[PDB]
């Protein structure tokens, strides 16, 4: 050797409260803590006041991440009417970006990285709520697959694409979409300019856009060559299962404006706490 320098605790129930008596002495001060160390206070209830033996049988299963995310939520509403300007040709291409509704978005913004599987549910209804015997076709378009330009296109042959033939008189179809992200987990917040070279003002749209969360398009159409006389409104519901979370973040107290970047209104900024008249009145 010529060179020398080159050589989890399972808590199914809550914690019980043990009995304690009065204390009189110096040197021990469980009340006085230091908040400048970045740590929470480790003081308990028995070290300050007199407590009794309390057997705590309260369960902590509702506070788990899996039970908090196993409830379905509305993520997208696709309107395919007969009259209008947007999707009157008989087909509708919806890009897969689950940021359009603020009920399930605030749950996903609680954590930074989240690896999970999802369960999609597609409910078909008319704009007035009625139902007609109409045949509907779903299709999943991953990035790299051709997008259809009509209802009789070659992309609706669906050789390798997943497709669900459902009817409006049928129950809603449930599928299980797996973890399709190329990274280890989904990244809800991307910090930095992902492009290369010198960044200009016209290329400022690419901020906060990660390619790992872009799953492509979701295309629907009416099965047939002729146009259907009935308007079709589709609602997508995602159920999160087998969820692992990392790096918790503060929630948002501001109303959402855009789904691309978390912008907020500058003139009207609503406070988190409810205001009152005086600090000494109640």
């Amino acid at each position, epitope marked *: 050797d010529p060179i020398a320098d080159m050589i989890l605790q399972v808590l199914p129930t809550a914690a019980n409260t043990e009995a304690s008596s009065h204390r009189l002495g110096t040197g021990v001060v469980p009340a006085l803590q230091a908040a400048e160390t970045g740590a929470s206070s480790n003081a308990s209830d028995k070290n300050l006041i007199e407590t009794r033996c309390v057997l705590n049988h309260h369960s902590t299963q509702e506070t788990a991440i899996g039970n908090f995310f196993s409830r379905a939520g509305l993520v997208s509403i696709i309107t395919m009417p007969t*009259m*209008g*300007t*947007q999707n*009157t*040709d008989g087909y509708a291409n919806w890009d897969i970006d689950l940021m359009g509704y603020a009920q399930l978005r605030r749950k996903c913004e609680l954590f930074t990285y989240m690896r999970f599987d999802a369960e999609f549910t597609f409910v078909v209804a008319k704009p007035n709520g009625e139902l007609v015997p109409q045949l509907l076709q779903y299709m999943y378009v991953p990035p790299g697959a051709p997008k259809p330009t009509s209802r009789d296109s070659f992309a609706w042959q669906t050789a390798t694409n997943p497709s669900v033939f459902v009817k409006m008189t049928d129950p809603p179809a449930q599928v299980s979409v797996p973890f399709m992200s190329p990274a280890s987990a989904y990244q809800w917040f991307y910090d930095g300019y992902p492009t290369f070279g010198e960044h200009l003002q016209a290329n400022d749209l690419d901020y906060g856009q990660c390619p790992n969360n872009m799953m492509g398009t979701f295309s629907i159409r009416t099965v047939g060559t*002729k*146009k259907s*006389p009935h308007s079709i409104t589709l609602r997508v519901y995602m159920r999160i299962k087998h969820v692992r979370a990392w790096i918790p973040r503060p929630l948002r107290n501001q109303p959402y404006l855009f789904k691309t970047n978390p912008n907020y209104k500058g003139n009207d900024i609503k406070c988190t706490s409810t205001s009152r008249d005086k600090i000494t009145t109640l």
Partner: antibody
Amino acid sequence: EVQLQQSGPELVKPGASVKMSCKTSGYTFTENTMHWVRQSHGKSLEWIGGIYPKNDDTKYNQKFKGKATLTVDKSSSTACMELRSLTSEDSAVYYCARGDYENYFYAMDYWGQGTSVTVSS
Amino acid sequence: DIQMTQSPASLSVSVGETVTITCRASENIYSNLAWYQQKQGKSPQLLVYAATNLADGVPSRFSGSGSGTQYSLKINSLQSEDFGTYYCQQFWDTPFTFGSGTKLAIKR
């Protein structure tokens, strides 16, 4: 109450391009769609395509997809079109008119003046 | 593409007789029909939309009726200013197609 004025008749050579205009007033331009209807010899009618002028929305024909583009300026109330790779059979009059509120159906009541465009060398 | 065929191509009749022109589409368009009147060197004007309701500036002499694929347009009574070609337009399938045209002349 609604008057649609087009550009003047221009004589162009085959191989070049042309650009017309359709200026109108009397109504809200951003809330009503527009269409373009050509009339070849003798009485045959075709449909170029529709345009919903909010930001950008165009419904192209399957035959005239690559030979016609529709642009809308939001400052002045006008509608301009552009054609590429003109030939002898593309010499016909062009019409412009206002459609329906937020709809491509409910066909046009008030039409344009019909500026004739001829292609000859 | 849903094509339309009008019959007849040209019909000449005098002033004071009923004129019945027909418009027929290859597929069902669900009563989405229009009617135009183009004079010599003039812009066309809408006569009756959706085959039951006439537009503004249109008199009560023009009355259209029809359902399904086959349609009709009845003119009673005919005047001297109603001469010109007539077209029909569908609102069902993109692109919209027009008829072949029906010229109305004066019988002598």
